Design a binder for this molecule. Structure first.
Ligand code: AL0
Ligand code: AL0
Ligand code: AL0
Ligand code: AL0
Ligand code: ZN
Lengths: 310, 153, 310, 310, 310
């Protein structure tokens, strides 16, 4: 069957360029020609140990669009899981006897990988494990960039905001570094700069990257403007204000932007992108969000259905 | 019968013996690797004379051999320690602990939010040698630290 | 139609040996040959007034595996039910006009029976009502024993742990006492011994049973080792420790066990069975849990579909 | 009569050199000869809008040791608090008519200064206002250094830990900078280094300071080792642990320390000072805390009693 | 001067016969002639790590009746409590520098004894530590029996209720066993009987004791009827009610009681003593509670004041 058949989808790093291409290819296909009965008699577990509505609704919607059945929860004190000392291991050993696939979201970093060792034959798709991995988020980002730019190589990518803790941009930076000729522009306050280990990686692959203090500094060159969330709880309230400065995007900043540029954002944007931007042709965060359905549908189709789509 | 003595202090026979273990690292290996869970005989000596100027530990455990992906596991603790197979010197290559690609079951992830802590799984870290340092990447949380971090906490 | 068609499934005691046989027969059948469309246009209410994730996920998974639609909740302060003085009666009178069947779990002992009086024609399946009844749990246990032992009569059954409050073992003991030649071994601390009313029943049916202080005392004879949960909140913290002694199972204890013995556990086992047991061929609690799907599927099929399965 | 009689004690910066000396002199005098009836007929309000048990009990004990009465609340979500309606202004305008002095702890910066504009000739003592000021904490710190070192000038002060957010060290640095010939050693992870505005101040006064990565780099010359608390939340778990290195203190590290050195800590030392340090003669954090009674008794004495004591 | 001056009061078992007599004698003296300024300049800490309003108010009232000042917290989840970080040791090492005595209530057994090793010449009085000790409760009990019966020897003592978990009766039994010729009557449901270790002690000293199923079996010879609280949670609802029988007391039951009998109860009597008992001359639980002030005033007086009172 297809290369991802019955494979656990835990980390983006475990995904080869080939894999990414196949997932993105499938995504485009299902988008063009939906297959509502593909996974008809399948039952999928949507296990959100840590709540995350949007990601959960996107994931489950994908399951339904393929015809699969869904059961699950949101352990945010809504269930009766692991009260005293009941392990994640035992939970998986149980649930893995009920369903055909487990989609899980957990607060601890290696949850999905652990699940993998107790789910015998049942595939586990990581919907997010603490500060570590979030495979499908990266896939939907790459898909959006590819669809709006027509390729994933030789692009000018700007990433703004909290580049230090936003593991969303770490995963996306590494994903794009598996393609050639990309140039990166990193805009972030000194206290939240891209980590050195990421720059080390870019250097060793000879990829070009530069630091900048403002978006306007490179607005003219950028193909993709990736806006990130800057959590208040991070810095000091006064610290934030002093830096939020322009790591905030406003319609006015797009005066000299490329006709093809798209502004992306992991989503909760309240404090980073002004609504006046929503009207411009560059705003693509809602479309980006909409693409989560195809990337996640493609992933489920690939691991649960032997042959390729069509 | 061919064995020949009653030695409770320093002997030999079909058994593995680890050599030149730094002081306070011998007992560590006994614990970390549960080398006393054996039924086979064991003779250890600690804080004894070294290369004419120091102190060292010594571990002799009869009727049992070590492998390549095991002796290596001593690399992070007893680097310059030699391991003479002793069925009677049936040792081949210059058996010295090299750095393994993976170190399991002994290390503890410094990351408090790592799933490995409250679960029935074995620790597992990938090894990468650094200049003045050693990087260990947790199989689970995928966070990377220096052995100096992983050995303190 | 079949004897259980349109029948409420509230108490194991209301189930005749015939009934148990029919449910177990159906369970094996659906297990062998799944029927994903059996209950296609049915809508089932999954009403967990009291939360219980595993039991809920098992139950709903069963509904989907049969093709039915599911709606419901977990009243653990997640809903807006009975705020001031809104009765269970009224809740049922309402919900019973929406769905084709009600699966309910409630904190009070006669909830399911009450529901029965206000659900006109709509069948109610008790998923647990306080310290009283839990029909499907017993059915899945019996099914597991039958499948692993090849019968439900003439067996050596050991029950360890909190035999006083574990209503799981009370129901299972009574269920097995409807079959012949079974011998029971009761292992529990004096403060949590099997209740006298249960022993009275065994005596009046002339069934053999004996008390023991340790598992090893009978490990050689047992066909089924039923391990129960011992809640901390029960005894005194120091009391527990002093008795937990060996009412805990470890791989080492299985040295002289019968090749056919299976170790069962209602599930939350953290504090009773050591993980090293999980590897032995005797560990059957996860398989046991997996069987909940077939026993519960069989029950739903029987009450919602006139003719027998196939 | 005395310079601080009836004055508001809000910011350590409003305190002149002589004020600090006066407070410290008074503290020593009350420590040598208690005056249990000095504030006999006074009634003081202990208003902890933000709970802070240790400093609250310290403040209240000070009040009782001077004979004053205490009313108050640690409205840490357990008082008919202004349902986010009543302003702090109104609360103070009411309370200032009941008591003779107001000691308040608040989550917002500026709270105590605002109270000052609504209190009526009733002095307000700031027990901490968000990330701004904690006057009495700096006073007990200063008092403890003076008592142990015999002076506040020509000392070698090392500050370890979170220098970026630990506002107690910001205040203590600015207070010690009001004395001559002091030498500072700053030891902290680069992500939590001393703020540049603090270094600017020191350069402006020609005060000698330097950065170090470990305590063992300066252990030899230090007179005062001020240990700061590092809250993991300020960084990510993996980050914290990574830097944790030596920024924690343990007995073995004091092998080459000066006979007169004292190790200080605001408290909550759980994660910074190993208990094997408590026994050394250098440990002085519990004595430091004990000096809070004297420094705070001194302030109350000065602001509410015209004539000096002893 | 006095035997208990500056001593820690942690376990009733560390108290010798003479100690009990001394405490009781002091209590009677303070009851006959109050000394409102005895502890005038003392400052005492009331630390209820575990909320216990009644015994807390009783303890604090005792402090004020001797003229001492009080600081403290019922950190029943409403104090900047050590966020499960700061050890009890550190809390005590700090608090012991502020006050002259520490009265503490804690959820864990051993808390008060541990405080003892970190307090500095500062006496610690145990207000209750988990299921271990409650010294002052036994003292007020003993004091109340002595006052009403004129002695603590040659009495007929009945203890009804939960004898298994009611540690106040365990302590009271062991205390009365330090006196000669006492006769005990134990009335409790078999699932909550007196622990064998207690009976062992009585046999070891030749003390006469016996078990009874109802109070009306011994009402005729009883001098003291000690009623215990029975928390339903200790059993299941159906179990509780079933045994409830007569283990509850009501006026009609006292028809044949001895003129001198007093009915005692630690309180929370909601479910054991009917209100129609309150009017009889035998009801003495409210007087019993009122004696807590005297027994606890006595301890504070003895530990903090060298010379005896009256
Ligand atoms: N996934 C987010 C919540 N969110 O926005 N969901 O759509 C979180 O858990 O932080
Ligand atoms: N049914 C259990 C919870 N659980 O384990 N559910 O799987 C309860 O309600 O106690
Ligand atoms: N440190 C706490 C107060 N407290 O109780 N300290 O012991 C705070 O800042 O809120
Ligand atoms: N009985 C309560 C205290 N209290 O307030 N009694 O009146 C306890 O043990 O926590
Ligand atoms: Zn890890």
């Amino acid at each position: 069957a297809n290369p991802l058949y019955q494979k656990h989808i835990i980390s983006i790093n475990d995904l080869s360029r080939d894999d990414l291409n196949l997932v993105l290819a499938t995504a485009a296909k299902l988008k063009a020609n939906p297959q509502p009965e593909l996974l008809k008699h399948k039952v999928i577990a949507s296990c959100f140990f840590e709540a995350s509505t949007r990601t959960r609704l996107s994931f489950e919607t994908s399951m339904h669009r393929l015809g699969a059945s869904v059961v699950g929860f949101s352990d945010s004190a809504n269930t009766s899981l692991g009260k005293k000392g009941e392990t994640l291991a035992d939970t998986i050993s149980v649930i893995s006897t009920y369903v055909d696939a487990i989609v899980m979201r957990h607060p601890q970093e290696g949850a999905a990988r652990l699940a993998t060792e107790f789910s015998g034959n049942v595939p586990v798709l990581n919907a997010g494990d603490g500060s570590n991995q979030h495979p499908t988020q990266t896939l939907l980002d790459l898909f959006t960039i590819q669809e709006t730019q027509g390729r994933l190589d030789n692009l000018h990518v700007a990433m703004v905001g909290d580049l230090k803790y936003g593991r969303t941009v770490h995963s996306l930076t590494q994903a794009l570094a598996k393609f050639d000729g990309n140039r990166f522009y990193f805009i972030a306050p000194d206290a939240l700069a891209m980590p050195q280990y990421i720059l080390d990686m870019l250097d060793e692959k000879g990829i070009a990257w530069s630091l900048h203090s403002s978006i306007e500094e490179v607005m003219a060159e950028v193909d993709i403007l990736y806006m990130t969330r800057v959590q208040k709880e991070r810095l000091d309230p006064s610290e934030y204000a002093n830096v939020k400065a322009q790591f905030v995007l406003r319609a006015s900043d797009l005066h000299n932007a490329k006709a093809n540029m798209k502004v992306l954002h992991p989503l909760p944007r309240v404090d980073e992108i002004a609504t006046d931007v929503d009207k411009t042709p560059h705003a693509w965060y809602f479309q980006q969000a909409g693409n989560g359905i195809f990337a996640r549908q493609a992933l489920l189709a690939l691991v649960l259905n032997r042959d390729l789509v069509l | 019968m061919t064995h020949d003595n009653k030695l409770q202090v320093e002997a030999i026979k079909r058994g593995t013996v680890i050599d030149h273990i730094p002081a306070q690292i011998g007992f560590k290996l006994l614990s970390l690797f549960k080398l006393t869970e054996t039924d086979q005989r064991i003779t250890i000596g600690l804080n004894l004379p070294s290369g004419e100027m120091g102190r060292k530990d010594l571990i002799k455990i009869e009727n049992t051999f070590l492998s390549e992906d095991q002796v290596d596991q001593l690399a992070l603790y007893a680097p310059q320690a030699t391991v003479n197979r002793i069925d009677n010197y049936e040792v081949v290559g210059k058996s010295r602990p090299s750095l393994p690609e993976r170190i399991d079951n002994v290390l503890v992830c410094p990351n408090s939010n790592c799933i490995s802590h409250a679960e029935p799984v074995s620790s597992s870290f990938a090894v990468r040698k650094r200049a003045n340092d050693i990087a260990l990447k947790c199989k689970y949380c995928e966070k990377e630290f220096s052995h100096n971090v992983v050995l303190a906490n």
